[PDB]
């Protein structure tokens, strides 16, 4: 009766079902957990918001087209305006979180295409000016739930001031490595003939026990079309990709007034 | 400060800092004073 | 406080180490560590996959 | 501990199908030859000794070339040639950097070795007595020299090495000195949060590890006063990571670096040579 | 060494000292506590924000003058915009809280005056029109940290629309009972010759285990000058009264999007 | 007459000392001494002060 294809995930007041899964990835074989006393750093009693924040948040959907080059998000950036998770994140200097990432893309037995879904620790990307190095604005680095898109062309700016965004070049994974090697990162593939969802469970990953969520994204989420969407009756068809992410084992230190980041 | 002078012989510091305040008004002076520490990353506080 | 350990075999025994310095940072290379767990990268799946069984049942 | 031996196996005719899988799961292929062919028994005595992290990193790599000179300096520019300062980094060269960047995080002690070379700038300005070099490690915050003979070189607290030209390459060990529980090779973030309506510049700020990294400064001088003969020196700095741990593997750098970040160069993003045909042996 | 006059209170990252206290009141002899499984109502796992919210918040100070008739606040209304307490309150349908109330008023050995400090369960007050009954706007009932003032005159409005505020008549405690009987409520007195502070520890009080904080104030805080401020060198002198309140054993149920009440 | 002592921990054991000289002045650095009594400077008071009690009673 039980199947690798059929899964239920419940966190807080939120449940996901899938009937065409392909198992689930636990990044580096490690389930998220709270911070042990023997690895702790800040000494204030932490906030552990539990069910208020450790629940599935659904981002705005994106459209997969035959011409799409792919999508990226950063975490915790993508969830910074998500209910009580966002409030706990911005009221504290320090935060740590694991995640359940659930990527959703259904089609038909007549559609074809394959998405690589990668969770990348410290997903540092190239800037779009050759007048400077490491020259990216906070606003362009932290787009929130809208995330960004890859391109198949690199066109760095004439002026340094116009190039303060990522050069998200698909085949170099936006960071000067070949995309074919992205499989060294925790991943699943949504191959439309096989599965309609990817599930990745991510522990907290950093060189520290806890860090400044508003300064530092721990994970990149990359969705690359490895094989282009094709549908014989309409080559111009679009199918949605929906990203749903639950924080897990969230812990916050250094309470004060709320952080309100620059928007320009 | 003595702490500041010692810290300037080192590159790294960790731990809790103690701020002790001595009121030197007359015995007849009363009052209540709020002393605050706001961890970083938000608007620096300029109001109570 | 001499350590006697196996050498790496050559074409056709043991060697002696004494640490001369009070800081471990001063020490020669760590001894060969053959530890490995490729599965944390090659098979980081929640549900066990038996090679002889279907990957998807 | 050895790499895997091959067991004796014959054929199969079975509902057991180890040749098929579903890599959508995020699992790599797992099948080995005994799953898909008839195999003999082969005892494998071979080991993965030389691909342990300690073995892979167990080399002194050149990370920079510094220059210092010793002559009678009469201009500001020539006074600045009598000593040099270098922000300690592995990003001046590409080879050790690329090996480290197989990993996101690392923890290691460092062996630092130096190779010091000289040449005469000119003939018919006489000779030069054998030179002593001072290499001073200036941790962040310690005062940096503005002249080759200022007070900073007394080095009461900073570690200095005095090297005599022609002696064995000088060498010292550095502990794991990171202020985090590991070194970060990559940092997807900023040094500070820019806040709503603040007047602080957001137009000329940087991104990533360059905004947060500081391993201090190496300052080098010739201790000797000037000879009639101008001597020019190179100091090659070597790093060997030892007692190594690494976490979170990454695809290696596929295209040329163009600075301290992950940025790439428009004329150098075509690493593959096109094959004549998909059917080219 | 230990004295009824000298007290330290620590909650979360906040500490109060007083050197001229008069013991402390525990309302109805009951310390606040979390909601037991045998008295529980909503079944979702509650949020217990602990140190993020259960800490001293200092309100804007008010000025005690020889002509002051008194001050009122409602709880949790007075704390609705206080750090993470306010955020937890408005992100949830349901909340319960106890409080430590610390009222601060120092003067000199030459000043005189006495403040009654009363914690009143269900502090329902009269409206200011005789054209209607129970006719008070949400905005006027819920002033927040500024609270309100008592008057020694009752002047109900000509038009019903102009009288939708409390008739906070001092000697009738704004509710048709004699102020001299307010001592049946948990109270202290700040008598300037004796003490410079009042401390009241309040359990949650309601006919329910948990309720809608944005709809319903559980406690009124009343400060009445029982004996007028007097200072011989300057009868027009003013001394501050400062109110500092810590939520305690806070528990919230029914997480959703944030409540944003009407401001007009 | 070899002394074997604990090294200061690094990124990821013991070391050996032999004194070669007849004068202790010739010896390497004194071993780490973690002794401390801040109270002789931070609290040099005749009568014990209990933190939780009033400083002046
Ligand atoms: C670094 C360099 O090139 N040095 C060269 C100098 C310089 O040109 C001086 O300006 C003039 O002595 O000239 C030489 O002819 C010399 O002095 O014997 C050869 C020498 O190698
Ligand atoms: Ca909690
Ligand atoms: Ca199989
Ligand atoms: Ca076989
Ligand atoms: Ca010199
Ligand atoms: Ca909790
Ligand atoms: Ca005391
Ligand atoms: Cl957003
Ligand atoms: Cl040279
Ligand atoms: Cl000197
Ligand atoms: Cl560091
Ligand atoms: Cl070819
Ligand atoms: Cl308010
Ligand atoms: Mg949003
Ligand atoms: Mg307010
Ligand atoms: Na073997």
- Spell out the SS3 assignment of B12-46: CCCCCCCCCCCCCCCCCCCCCCCCCCCCCCCCCCC
- CB-nearest to F9 from C1, C18, C24 is C24
Is E145 labelled as part of a ligand binding site? yes
Q: In terms of CA atoms, which chain C residue is nearest residue D249?
A: C41
Query: CA E188: distance to chain centroid?
Result: 13
Q: Are A254 and A44 in contact (CB under 8 A)?
A: yes
Chains that touch E (3 or more CB pairs under 8 A): A, B, F
What residue owns the CA closest to ligand 1's atom 1? D121
Which residues 138-167 of chain D have a CB within 8 Å of chain F?
A: none
Q: Are E93 and E251 in contact (CB under 8 A)?
A: no
Strands of the sheet with A148-149, listed across from one edge:
A148-149, A71-75, A219-230, A112-121, A187-191
**Residue C36 neighbours by CB under 8 Å, 6+ apart:** D48
Query: Can you read off the two tokens belonging to residue A228?
Result: 């282009």
A25 CA to chain C: closest CA distance, Å?
4
Which burial class, exposed, middle or buried, applies to C23 when counting CB atoms under 10 A from its CB (0-12, 13-18, 19+)?
middle
Cα of F51 to ligand 7 centre, how many Å? 4
Tell me how many helices (H) and strands (E) chain A has. Answer: 2, 13
Separation of alpha carbons E126 and B13, rounded Å: 59
Q: Which atom of ligand 1 is nearest to the CA of D122?
A: 17
Pocket of ligand 1 (CB under 6 A): D 121-123
Separation of alpha carbons B1 and B4, rounded Å: 5
Separation of alpha carbons A182 and D257, rounded Å: 19
Cα of A141 to ligand 8 centre, how many Å? 12
* Element spanning A87, H or E: helix A83-91
Inter-chain touch A261–D195, beta carbons under 8 Å: yes
Which residues in chain A have their C atom more than 2.5 Å from the N of the next written residue, marking a break after them? none
What residue owns the CA closest to ligand 1's atom 16? D122
Query: Can you read off the two tokens belonging to residue E31?
Result: 């310390």
- CB-nearest to C51 from D18, D175, D243 is D18
Query: Can you read off the two tokens belonging to residue F34?
Result: 């973690």
CATH classification code of F1-57: 4.10.80.10
Residue labelled with tokens 């959508």: D24
The angle formed by the CA atoms of residues D258, D261 and D263, to the nearest 5 degrees, is 55
Separation of alpha carbons A58 and A103, rounded Å: 10
Query: Can you read off the two tokens belonging to residue F52?
Result: 């939780």
Query: Can you read off the two tokens belonging to residue E71?
Result: 């001050």
Query: CA D17: distance to chain centroid?
Result: 46
Radius of gyration of chain E (CA): 19
Mutational test site, ligand 1, from D122, D128, D228, D229, max ligand atoms within 8 Å of CB: D122
* Element spanning D234, H or E: strand D231-249
Instruction: State the structure-solving technique.
Output: X-ray
Residue labelled with tokens 């939708």: E164
Cα of D277 to ligand 12 centre, how many Å? 7
Residue A51 sits at φ, ψ, to 5 deg, of -65, -25
Q: Are E84 and E258 in contact (CB under 8 A)?
A: no
Chain D positions in Cβ-Cβ contact with residue C45 (cut-off 8 Å): 25-27
Residue labelled with tokens 């259960």: E54
To one decimal, the resolution in angstroms is: 1.8
Q: What is the DSSP letter of C33?
A: -
Strand-pair category, C14-17 with C3-6: antiparallel
Query: Can you read off the two tokens belonging to residue D122?
Result: 């000119």
In chain C, where are the structural domains located? 1-57
The Cβ of residue E54 has, within 10 Å, a number of other Cβ atoms equal to 24
The 3-state DSSP class for residue E213 equals: coil
E144 CA to chain B: closest CA distance, Å?
16
In chain D, where are the structural domains located? 1-281
Separation of alpha carbons E3 and E110, rounded Å: 23
Inter-chain touch C44–A26, beta carbons under 8 Å: yes
Separation of alpha carbons B43 and A214, rounded Å: 13
CA distances from D260 to A4, A49, D225, E143 (A): 44, 39, 36, 55
Residues in the 5 Å CB sphere of ion ligand 12:
D 275-276, 280
Separation of alpha carbons A207 and A217, rounded Å: 13
* Element spanning A247, H or E: strand A239-255
Domains of chain E: 1-264 (2.60.120.20)
Give the N- to C-terminal CA distance of chain F in Å, as an integer. 59
A257 CA to chain B: closest CA distance, Å?
6
Separation of alpha carbons B35 and B32, rounded Å: 10
* Element spanning D99, H or E: helix D95-100
Residue A35 sits at φ, ψ, to 5 deg, of -80, 120
Residues of E with CB under 8 A from a CB of F: 1-3, 6
Inter-chain touch D140–B11, beta carbons under 8 Å: yes
The 3-state DSSP class for residue D25 equals: helix
Cα of E250 to ligand 2 centre, how many Å? 10
Query: CA E47: distance to chain centroid?
Result: 24
Dihedral through CA D2, CA D3, CA D9, CA D11, nearest 10? 170
Cα of C13 to ligand 16 centre, how many Å? 21
Separation of alpha carbons D26 and C47, rounded Å: 12
Radius of gyration of chain D (CA): 27
Query: Can you read off the two tokens belonging to residue E81?
Result: 């915009």
Strand-pair category, E239-255 with E57-58: antiparallel
Q: In terms of CA atoms, which chain F residue is nearest residue E6?
A: F54
Separation of alpha carbons B30 and B23, rounded Å: 10
**Residue F48 neighbours by CB under 8 Å, 6+ apart:** none
Strand-pair category, A25-26 with A197-202: parallel
Q: In terms of CA atoms, which chain D residue is nearest residue C51?
A: D18
Cα of D225 to ligand 12 centre, how many Å? 61
The angle formed by the CA atoms of residues A157, A161 and A163, to the nearest 5 degrees, is 35
Separation of alpha carbons D48 and B19, rounded Å: 57
CA distances from D173 to B12, C22, D269 (A): 20, 12, 38
Chain D positions in Cβ-Cβ contact with residue C48 (cut-off 8 Å): none
Residue labelled with tokens 């593959």: D272
Residue labelled with tokens 């089609």: A107
Query: Can you read off the two tokens belonging to residue A191?
Result: 């191959």
Separation of alpha carbons F44 and F39, rounded Å: 6
Chain E positions in Cβ-Cβ contact with residue A13 (cut-off 8 Å): 44, 255
Q: Looking at domain D1-281, which of 3.90.980.10, 1.10.150.120, 2.60.120.20, 3.40.50.720 is its CATH number?
A: 2.60.120.20
Separation of alpha carbons E79 and C55, rounded Å: 56
Q: Are D251 and A181 in contact (CB under 8 A)?
A: yes
Is E48 labelled as part of a ligand binding site? yes
Mark residue D97 as left, alpha or beta (left: phi above 0; alpha: psi -120 to 50; beta: remaining): alpha
Query: Can you read off the two tokens belonging to residue E212?
Result: 């809608």
* Element spanning A139, H or E: helix A138-141
Separation of alpha carbons F13 and F4, rounded Å: 10
Chain C positions in Cβ-Cβ contact with residue A248 (cut-off 8 Å): none
Separation of alpha carbons A187 and A185, rounded Å: 6
Print burial letters for E106-133: b (CB count within 10 Å at least 16), e (below 16): bbeeebbbbbbbbbbeebebbbbbeeee
Q: Are E231 and E111 in contact (CB under 8 A)?
A: yes
Greatest Cα pair distance, chain D, in angstroms, is: 90
D20 CA to chain A: closest CA distance, Å?
14
Mutational test site, ligand 1, from D67, D78, D81, D121, max ligand atoms within 8 Å of CB: D121
Note the ligand closest to the C-alpha atom of D231: 9
Whether E110 has its CB under 8 Å from any CB of chain B: the answer is yes
Separation of alpha carbons D191 and E94, rounded Å: 39
């Amino acid at each position: 009766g039980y199947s690798d294809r059929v899964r239920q995930i419940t966190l807080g007041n939120s449940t996901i079902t899938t009937q065409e899964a392909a198992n689930a990835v636990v990044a580096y074989g490690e389930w998220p957990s709270y911070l042990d006393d023997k690895e702790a750093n800040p000494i204030d009693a932490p906030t552990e918001p539990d069910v208020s924040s450790n629940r599935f948040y659904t981002l705005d959907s994106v459209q997969w087209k035959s011409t799409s080059r792919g999508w990226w998000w950063k975490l915790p950036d993508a969830l910074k305006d998500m209910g009580m998770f966002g409030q706990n994140m911005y009221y504290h200097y320090l935060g740590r979180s694991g995640y359940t990432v659930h990527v959703q893309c259904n089609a038909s037995k007549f559609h074809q295409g394959a998405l690589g879904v990668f969770a990348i620790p410290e997903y540092v990307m190239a800037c779009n000016t050759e007048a400077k190095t490491s020259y990216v604005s906070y606003v362009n680095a932290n787009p929130g739930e809208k995330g960004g898109v890859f391109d198949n062309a690199y066109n760095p700016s004439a002026e340094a001031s116009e190039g303060r965004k990522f050069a998200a070049l698909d085949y170099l994974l936006g960071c000067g490595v070949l995309a074919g090697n992205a499989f060294v990162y925790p991943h699943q593939i949504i191959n439309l003939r096989t599965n309609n969802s990817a599930t990745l469970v991510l522990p907290y990953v950093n060189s520290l026990a806890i860090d400044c969520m508003a300064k530092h994204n721990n994970w990149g989420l990359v969705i690359l079309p490895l094989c282009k969407l094709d549908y014989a009756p309409n080559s111009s068809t679009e199918i949605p990709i929906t990203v749903t992410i639950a924080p897990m084992f969230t812990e916050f230190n250094g309470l004060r007034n709320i952080t309100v980041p620059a928007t320009q | 400060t003595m702490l500041g002078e010692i810290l300037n012989y080192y590159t790294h510091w960790t731990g809790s800092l103690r701020f002790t305040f001595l009121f030197c008004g007359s015995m007849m002076a009363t009052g209540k004073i709020l002393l605050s520490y706001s961890p970083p990353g938000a608007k620096p506080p300029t109001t109570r | 406080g001499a350590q006697v350990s196996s050498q790496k075999v050559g074409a056709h025994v043991n060697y002696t180490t004494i640490n001369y310095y009070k800081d471990s940072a001063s020490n020669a290379a760590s001894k060969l560590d053959f530890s490995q767990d490729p599965s944390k990268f090659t098979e980081p799946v929640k549900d066990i996959m038996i090679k002889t069984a279907p990957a998807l049942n | 501990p050895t790499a895997q031996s091959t067991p004796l196996t014959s054929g199969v005719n079975s509902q057991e199908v180890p040749a098929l899988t579903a890599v959508e799961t995020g699992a790599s292929g797992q099948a080995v030859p005994s799953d898909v062919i008839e195999t003999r028994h082969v005892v494998n005595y071979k080991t993965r000794s030389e691909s342990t992290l300690e073995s892979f990193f167990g080399r002194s790599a050149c990370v920079t070339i510094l220059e210092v000179e010793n002559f009678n300096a009469t201009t500001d520019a020539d006074r600045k040639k009598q000593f040099t300062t270098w922000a300690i980094t592995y990003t001046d060269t590409v080879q050790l950097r690329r090996k480290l960047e197989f990993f996101t995080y690392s923890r290691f002690d460092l062996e630092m070795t130096f190779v010091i070379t000289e040449r005469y700038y000119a003939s018919n300005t006489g000779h030069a007595r054998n030179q002593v070099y001072q290499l001073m490690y200036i941790p962040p915050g310690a005062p940096r020299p503005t002249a080759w003979d200022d007070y900073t070189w007394q080095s009461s607290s900073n570690p200095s090495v005095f090297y005599t030209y022609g002696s064995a390459p000088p060498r010292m060990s550095i502990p794991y000195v990171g202020i985090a529980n590991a070194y970060s090779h990559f940092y997807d973030g900023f040094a500070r949060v820019p806040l709503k309506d603040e007047t602080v510049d957001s137009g000329d700020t940087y991104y990533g590890l360059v905004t947060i990294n500081d391993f201090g400064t190496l300052a080098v001088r010739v201790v000797n006063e000037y000879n009639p003969a101008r001597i020019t020196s190179k100091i090659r700095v070597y790093m060997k990571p030892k007692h190594v741990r690494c976490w979170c593997p990454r695809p290696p750098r596929a295209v040329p670096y163009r600075g301290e970040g992950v940025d790439f160069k428009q004329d150098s993003i075509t690493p593959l040579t096109a094959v004549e045909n998909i059917n080219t042996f």
